[PDB]
RNA sequence: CACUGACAGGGAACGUGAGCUGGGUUUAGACCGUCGUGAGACAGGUUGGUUUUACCCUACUUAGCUGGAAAUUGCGAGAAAAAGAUUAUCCGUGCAAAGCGGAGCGGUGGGUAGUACUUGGUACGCUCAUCACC
RNA sequence: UUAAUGAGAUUCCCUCUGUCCCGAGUUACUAUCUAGCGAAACGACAGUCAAGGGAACGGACUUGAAGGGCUAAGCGGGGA
RNA sequence: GAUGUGGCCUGGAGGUUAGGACGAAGCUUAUGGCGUGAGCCUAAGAUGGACCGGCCUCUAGUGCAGAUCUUGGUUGGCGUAGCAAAGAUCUAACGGAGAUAUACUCAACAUGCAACGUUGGAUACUGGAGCGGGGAAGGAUUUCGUGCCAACGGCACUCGUA
RNA sequence: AAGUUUGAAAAGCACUUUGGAAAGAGAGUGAAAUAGAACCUGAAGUCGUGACAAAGACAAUGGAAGUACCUCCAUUUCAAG
C-alpha cells in the first residue's frame, strides 16, 4: 500500500524519526507444519506481530504420493451450482501455510480477523527482510527431534510443484543468489571480528586485577 | 429418473462468460516461446480489415485426388500501413509473477500518438510529453537514461517494444478514429543484451509488415468477433425449438433444472449477450503480401493472368473504400466486421504438417463487383461489352463546339 | 408558520402553496434539488429541464424507472424529466422573489435555505376489474413550503 | 424392420405441469354384457368431456454506478525496496581492490542547404532568440 | 339387413404442405425509453450453500464454505 | 389444577378528608424516585382551558396480542402492472392567463416545454343491413341560449349529456 | 353514515403587494388565529425536514458485563469540614 500524501505532510510537520513495529522473523525450514501453526496462531492471538520465511522448505510426515493425494481430494471439492463462490484453493507453499494458520484461529470474529492480518509469509528470504536482525526457530517443533529419522517425509515445496505451483525455478534461483550474496559479505567481515576478539582478549592485561576476580568467580574470562 | 435419450449438451463452457469485451481492439495474451538460439525480432503486427474475395490456385500434395489441380478459395484482405515504435519496456521475474522495470520514451513523438492522452484535444493545452521532453536532454536525463538501460541489462528477462499506427498514413474515410492504436510487441531471439541493442536501433522509426512476416508462412489473429446485442437462447446457444401448440412461447429452455440443487446451476442455457467477444484464432495461411499501390499498380496481376489491375474491386470495398497501402492476403475468414482493427502474431503451434509447409502460388485473383452480381473483371471490359453510350455521346458532341 | 425559522428574519423570503395538484412523489424529487442554490441558478435549472439539456435526479422514490446519462452530474444513474412539478415550482420561486423585492431586498443575492414538501389529503376515484370488481383511483397532492435567505459577501 | 464402432444399466420429490401436451386414469351425458325385485353396482368394455396467477425474495443470465487495508474509525507506522556522518555527489566493481568524473548545450521560435523515412511532417548541419538549468 | 343422410367413432390411398429433418428472413401491435394518469394479489419475521442430527426433505440450530454497498432488463430451480 | 394476599388497576353509591383560573381532566417524555411485580408518585410542556385526588365501606356492562374476530383509519408492493379491437391526421390565421416567460456574459440554436377551441385549406374514413333521417319499450329536461371551468368527462380542455 | 362542540361576542381578516384564479407575503380583530368556518382538545400508526451517531457483507430484535461520548435528571459535598 502506498501511503498517501496526507500521511506523508503529516510526518513530515510532527517531524519524527523512521519508525519500525517489533516484528519477529521465523525461518521455517525443517520445520514441522501442523506444530509450528499451532505455535504461531497462539502467538498471534496473545497479540504478537510475525513474518515467517523459507516455507517452501517445510515438512510433513509420510510419503510425497500420500501428501498429493491428500491435496488432490482436497482440490475436488467444488460448488456444483457455482464454482466461482466455492472453496479457493491456493497452491502455493506460503498461502498453504496462511491456511493452515487460518483453520485454527475463530476467523468469523474481528478478534481472529485481527490476529490473521497480523502474520506475513514468504518463500525464500525476500531483500526487504534479509536484513532486519537474527532470525529464530521454533524448538518443540524441529524436524530432528520430532520425527523418527528411519520414515520419510515430504517436503512442502516438492508437493506443491506438482499440484501446480508454477514458482519453483524462480524461488531457487532467488535463494542461491542471496546465499552467494550472503557468503560474500561474512567472509568480507572476517577481519573485523577478528579485531574485535583479540581487543577482547588483551584487555584483561590493562584493566584493574579485582574486577577480573570478579569475572573469573562468576565465569567470564 | 435418467433421460430416456442422450445427446450432447449445447455449447462450450471454456469459453464463459458471454459478456461484453473490455476493449475493442485484439491484444495477445501471450507470446510464443523465446528461443535465445534465434536472431531478435518481432512478434507482432497491427492490421485493419477491409473485405474478402477468392482466388485460384494449383494443388501440390501427393496422395490427394486434387493433386495438380486448381481449386477455389476465399480470402480476406487487410490494410498494413507501417508502425512507429516509441518506447522500450523490460520485466523482470519474481515468485509473483512479471514486474515492469522501467520505459525508456523517443526524444520525440507523433501528434497522433500525443492525441491518444486525450477526450477532446483540439480544444486543450496539448502539453502531453513537454516535461519529459525537455528534461530528457539535459545532463541528468541522460544519466537517467543510462541507469533504466542499465537495469534492464542486470535484471531483466523480457524486452517489449511500444508501437503504435499511423492512421494519417491510413487515409480511409470511414475510420473515423484520429488517435493511434497502441501496444507492447515482444521481441524474440538472442539475449538481453542483443535484444536491447535492436529495441534501441528501431528507437523513432516506422516498421513494415513484411519485416515482420514472410509469404508462405502461418500466423495467429487475435480479434473482437461482431456484435449483436441482447439475444434469445435459440440463437445465442442452439438449442431446439418447441412444437407449434405450445402455450407461452415457443424458443425456449424447457426445464431448467431439477428439483434438487434447488438452485439454477451455470451450465444451463439463458438469454443474453452475443457477440463483441475476444478470440485467438490459430492458424491462417499467407497468402500474399501485397505493396503499396502508389509503388506498384499492378497488385493482383499473376504471372498466368497478365491483365493490370489492383486489389480494390470495381466499385470499391462495400462499406470501406480503396486500398492504399501495404496488405496482406490471407485464407479464409477472420472474426469482427469491416474497419476493425486485428493483431497478426506468429504461431505457437507446431508448423510441421504438410499444409502448413505448402508453397502457394496465385493464378486468379478476383475483381469484380461486390454490389450484385459482378460480372466485369476491369472497367476496361465493361466498356467493351457496351460500346459508347447516350452520356458519351453528349459528352462528346459538347466537348468539341469549345 | 414553518417548521425552521430563518437566522435574520428581516434579510428573508417566504412562500407557500397547499393541496398543489402535483404528484407528491414528483414534486418531492423536483423540489428537493434545489436546496442549497443561489435563486438565479435555481431557475436556470428549471428552464433547461423544461428544454431537456439537464434533468432531475430521482433519489427516493425511483424503484424500475429509466436510466439516463443526463443523471451523472448528480451522481446518480436515474433520473426524469417531470414538467407538470417543474412549471409549479417556477411559479413558487416566482411568489417568494416578489415577496423579497417587496422587502427590499436584492434577488440576484438570495440563497435556498428551507425547503418542505408533504403528502396532502387525498381524492377519491375508483376504477372497474373483472368479475364484476371495483378498485379505488387515488390522487395524491402535496403542500410545499420555503424560505430564502440574503447571503453576506 | 433397418443403420452402426456401439445401439450398457441407473439416480436427481419413481428429476422436470405459475415449462408444455392431455392419449390414458378419475365427476356430471349416453350405449353393451354380467349382477340386483328396485334405486343402482362392476378393481369389465365403449364414446364425449374449462389445464388459472409472478410486477415480490433468492438462484441463474447479461447490463451500469461507487466506497474500501483498524476492510468506512487511530493519529495503530510491517514495501517479494534502496543501502549509510542513523540511508543526507555521480557513475563502474562482488554490501571488493582499484580505477573514473564533477560557461557550457538543452526546450522554443526565424532565415540558410542537403539528406533519411510511405512521399505534406517529423528529425538532422549552420545561424540569431527568448527562456533555461547548472 | 339396409340405398340416402351425419360439425358422430375408426383404417388406408391420391393431392398437398415449415407437422417434422432444422431452422432463417420480413411486417403491424406490444414489451422496452419519455409526458400525463395510476391499481391489485399478496404481506409473522426474513431470505448464500455442503454435511449432521431433528416431527426421519432447515432461512434461522451444530461443524465447515462463501459473502463490499446500491441498481436496469429477463427468467421460471427453490420460497414443500 | 386448587387456594391465599391491610395485593395492583377501572366506571358509579354512602361517609370522611382535601385540591383548582397563582390553572382541573385529558395528552407528550434520554423527568427521575419508589416497589420482586401488577403499578404509584414527582418534574418539565416554549400543552390544555374547568373540574377533581386520598382513605373506610357499598356496587358492576370492571383489565386484551392474536378468535380466516367487529368497525374506522393507515401501509409495503409502486410512480410499478398497465391506460395496445373499431386504420389518421397535417397546415396557417384568429382566440385565450395558458408566452417568444433569462441573473452576469450574451445576435439568433445550444436556458418556457407540452397541450387546446373556431374558421379556411389539405388528406382519409363511414359506404344506404351507415359514427344517415324518423318511431315503440325504457329514461324524464338529458332539449335551447348566455356564462363558467372547483369537482366529474380513468390523458387533456379555452369544450361538455358537468 | 352523520354531535353544526369557532369565540363571551362575528369583532367571520378593511387595506397594500404578487398571481388568470386558487392562494402566498404583510397589515388588522380577539385573552388566544398552532380558536380562520365543519374551525374545543387533537393520541397512536405513517410520512417530511434539520442536527447528530455511527455502520461492511455477520437478517433484525434479545441477555450479561464493561467502555467511549452525551445528559433540559436526581442526590451529596465544598475548609476544617
Ligand atoms: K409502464
Ligand atoms: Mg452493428
Ligand atoms: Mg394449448
Ligand atoms: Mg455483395
Ligand atoms: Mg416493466
Ligand atoms: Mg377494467
Ligand atoms: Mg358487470
Ligand atoms: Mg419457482
Ligand atoms: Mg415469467
Ligand atoms: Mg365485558
Ligand atoms: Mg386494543
Ligand atoms: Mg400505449
Ligand atoms: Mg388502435
Ligand atoms: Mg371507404
Ligand atoms: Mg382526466
Ligand atoms: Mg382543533
Ligand atoms: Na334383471
Ligand atoms: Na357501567
Redesign the pocket.
Not at chain 1, 117 to 124: I, K, M
Not at chain 2, 240 to 248: F, G, M, Q, S, V
Not at chain 2, 270 to 273: F, K, L, S
Not at chain 3, 21 to 26: F, I, L, Q, V, W
Given at each position: 500500500?502506498f501511503?498517501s500524501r496526507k500521511?506523508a505532510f503529516?510526518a513530515q510537520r510532527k517531524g519524527?524519526k523512521?519508525?519500525?513495529?517489533e516484528?519477529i522473523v521465523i525461518d521455517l525450514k525443517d520445520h514441522v507444519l501442523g506444530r509450528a501453526a499451532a505455535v504461531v496462531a497462539k502467538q498471534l492471538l496473545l497479540g504478537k506481530?510475525?513474518?515467517v520465511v523459507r516455507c517452501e522448505q517445510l515438512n510433513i510426515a509420510g510419503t510425497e504420493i500420500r501428501n498429493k493425494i491428500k491435496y488432490l481430494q482436497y482440490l475436488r471439492k467444488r460448488?456444483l451450482?457455482?464454482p466461482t463462490?466455492?472453496?479457493?484453493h491456493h497452491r502455493?507453499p506460503?498461502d498453504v501455510f496462511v491456511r493452515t494458520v487460518?483453520?485454527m484461529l475463530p476467523?468469523?470474529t474481528?478478534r481472529g480477523?485481527?490476529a490473521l492480518?497480523?502474520?506475513?509469509?514468504?518463500?525464500?528470504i525476500?531483500?526487504?527482510?534479509?536484513?532486519t536482525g537474527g532470525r529464530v526457530v521454533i524448538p518443540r517443533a524441529q524436524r530432528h527431534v520430532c520425527y523418527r529419522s528411519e520414515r520419510p517425509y515430504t517436503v512442502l515445496g516438492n508437493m506443491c510443484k506438482h499440484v501446480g505451483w508454477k514458482y519453483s525455478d524462480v524461488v531457487a534461483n532467488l535463494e542461491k543468489a542471496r546465499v552467494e550474496?550472503?557468503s560474500?559479505?561474512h567472509e568480507?567481515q572476517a577481519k573485523l571480528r577478528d579485531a574485535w576478539k583479540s581487543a577482547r582478549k588483551e584487555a584483561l592485561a590493562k584493566m584493574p586485577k579485582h574486577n577480573v576476580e570478579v569475572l573469573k568467580k562468576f565465569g567470564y574470562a | 429418473?435418467?433421460?430416456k435419450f442422450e445427446h450432447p449438451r449445447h455449447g462450450h463452457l471454456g469459453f464463459?462468460?458471454?459478456?461484453?469485451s473490455r476493449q475493442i481492439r485484439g491484444r495477445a495474451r501471450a507470446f510464443p516461446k523465446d528461443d535465445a538460439t534465434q536472431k531478435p525480432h518481432l512478434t507482432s503486427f497491427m492490421v485493419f480489415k477491409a473485405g474478402m474475395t477468392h482466388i485460384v490456385r494449383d494443388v501440390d500434395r501427393p496422395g490427394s485426388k486434387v493433386n495438380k489441380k486448381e481449386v477455389v478459395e476465399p480470402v480476406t484482405i487487410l490494410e498494413?500501413?507501417?508502425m512507429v515504435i516509441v518506447g522500450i519496456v523490460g520485466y523482470r521475474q519474481?515468485?509473483?509473477g512479471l514486474?515492469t522495470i522501467g520505459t525508456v520514451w523517443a526524444?520525440?513523438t507523433?501528434?497522433e500518438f500525443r492525441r491518444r492522452y486525450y477526450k477532446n484535444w483540439k480544444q486543450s493545452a496539448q502539453l502531453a510529453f513537454?516535461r519529459q521532453?525537455?528534461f530528457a536532454?539535459?545532463?541528468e536525463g541522460k544519466?537517467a537514461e543510462?541507469?533504466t538501460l542499465?537495469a534492464f541489462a542486470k535484471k531483466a528477462s523480457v524486452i517489449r517494444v511500444i508501437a503504435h499506427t499511423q492512421l494519417?498514413?491510413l487515409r480511409n474515410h470511414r475510420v473515423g478514429v484520429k488517435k493511434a492504436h497502441v501496444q507492447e510487441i515482444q521481441v524474440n531471439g538472442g539475449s538481453v543484451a542483443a535484444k536491447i541493442a535492436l529495441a534501441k536501433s528501431l528507437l523513432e522509426?516506422?516498421v513494415?509488415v513484411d519485416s515482420v512476416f514472410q509469404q508462405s508462412e502461418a500466423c495467429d489473429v487475435c480479434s473482437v468477433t461482431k456484435g449483436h446485442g441482447?439475444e434469445g437462447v435459440?440463437?445465442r446457444w442452439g438449442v431446439?425449438?418447441?412444437?407449434?401448440?405450445?402455450?407461452?412461447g415457443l424458443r425456449?429452455?424447457?426445464?431448467?433444472?431439477?428439483?434438487?440443487?434447488?438452485?439454477?446451476?451455470?451450465t444451463?442455457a439463458?438469454?443474453?449477450?452475443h457477440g463483441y467477444h475476444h478470440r485467438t484464432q490459430l492458424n491462417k495461411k499467407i497468402y500474399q503480401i501485397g505493396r503499396?499501390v502508389?509503388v506498384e499498380p499492378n497488385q493482383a496481376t499473376t504471372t498466368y493472368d497478365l491483365t493490370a489491375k489492383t486489389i480494390t474491386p470495381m466499385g470499391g470495398f462495400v462499406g470501406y473504400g480503396t486500398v492504399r497501402?501495404?496488405y496482406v492476403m490471407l485464407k479464409g475468414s477472420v472474426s469482427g466486421p469491416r474497419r476493425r482493427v486485428m493483431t497478426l502474431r506468429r504461431p505457437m503451434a507446431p508448423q510441421t504438417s504438410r499444409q502448413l509447409k505448402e508453397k502457394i502460388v496465385l493464378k486468379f485473383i478476383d475483381t469484380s463487383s461486390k454490389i450484385g452480381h459482378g460480372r466485369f473483371q476491369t472497367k476496361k471490359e465493361k466498356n467493351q461489352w457496351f460500346g459508347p453510350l447516350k452520356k458519351d455521346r453528349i459528352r462528346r458532341e459538347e466537348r468539341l463546339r469549345k | 408558520?414553518y417548521?425552521?425559522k430563518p437566522q435574520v428574519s428581516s434579510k428573508s423570503?417566504?412562500?407557500?402553496?397547499?393541496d398543489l395538484?402535483?404528484?407528491?412523489?414528483?414534486t418531492?424529487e423536483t423540489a428537493?434539488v434545489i436546496?442549497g442554490m443561489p435563486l438565479?441558478?435555481a431557475?436556470?435549472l428549471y428552464?433547461?429541464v423544461?428544454?431537456?439539456?439537464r434533468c432531475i435526479p430521482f433519489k427516493?422514490?425511483?424503484?424500475?424507472?429509466?436510466?439516463?446519462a443526463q443523471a451523472k452530474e448528480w451522481?446518480?444513474?436515474?433520473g426524469?424529466?417531470?414538467?407538470?412539478?417543474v412549471?409549479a415550482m417556477?411559479?413558487l420561486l416566482?411568489?417568494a422573489e416578489?415577496?423579497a423585492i417587496?422587502?427590499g431586498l436584492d434577488p440576484?443575492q438570495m440563497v435556498i435555505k428551507?425547503?418542505?414538501?408533504?403528502?396532502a389529503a387525498?381524492?377519491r376515484?375508483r376504477?372497474?376489474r373483472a368479475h364484476g370488481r371495483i378498485?379505488?383511483?387515488?390522487?395524491?397532492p402535496c403542500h410545499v413550503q420555503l424560505f430564502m435567505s440574503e447571503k453576506k459577501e
Open positions: 500500500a501511503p500521511d503529516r519524527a523512521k519508525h519500525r513495529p516484528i506481530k510475525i513474518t460448488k451450482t457455482n463462490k466455492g472453496p479457493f502455493a506460503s487460518r483453520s476467523r468469523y474481528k480477523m485481527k492480518n497480523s502474520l506475513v509469509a514468504y518463500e525464500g525476500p531483500p526487504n527482510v534479509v536484513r550474496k550472503a560474500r559479505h568480507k | 429418473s435418467h433421460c464463459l462468460p458471454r459478456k461484453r498494413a500501413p507501417p519474481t515468485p509473483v514486474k526524444h520525440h507523433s501528434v513537454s521532453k525537455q536532454n539535459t545532463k544519466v543510462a541507469r542499465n494519417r498514413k522509426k516506422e513494415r441482447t435459440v440463437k431446439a425449438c418447441l412444437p407449434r401448440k405450445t402455450h407461452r425456449k429452455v424447457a426445464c431448467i433444472g431439477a428439483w434438487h440443487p434447488a438452485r439454477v446451476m451455470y444451463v439463458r438469454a443474453g449477450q503499396s502508389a497501402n501495404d | 408558520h417548521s425552521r423570503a417566504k412562500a407557500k402553496v397547499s395538484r402535483c404528484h407528491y412523489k414528483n418531492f428537493n436546496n438565479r441558478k431557475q436556470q428552464r433547461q423544461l428544454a431537456k439539456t427516493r422514490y425511483n424503484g424500475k424507472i429509466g436510466r439516463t451522481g446518480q444513474t436515474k426524469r424529466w417531470p414538467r407538470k412539478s412549471v417556477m411559479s416566482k411568489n416578489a415577496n417587496e422587502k440576484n428551507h425547503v418542505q414538501v408533504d403528502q387525498r381524492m376515484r376504477t372497474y378498485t379505488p383511483y387515488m390522487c395524491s
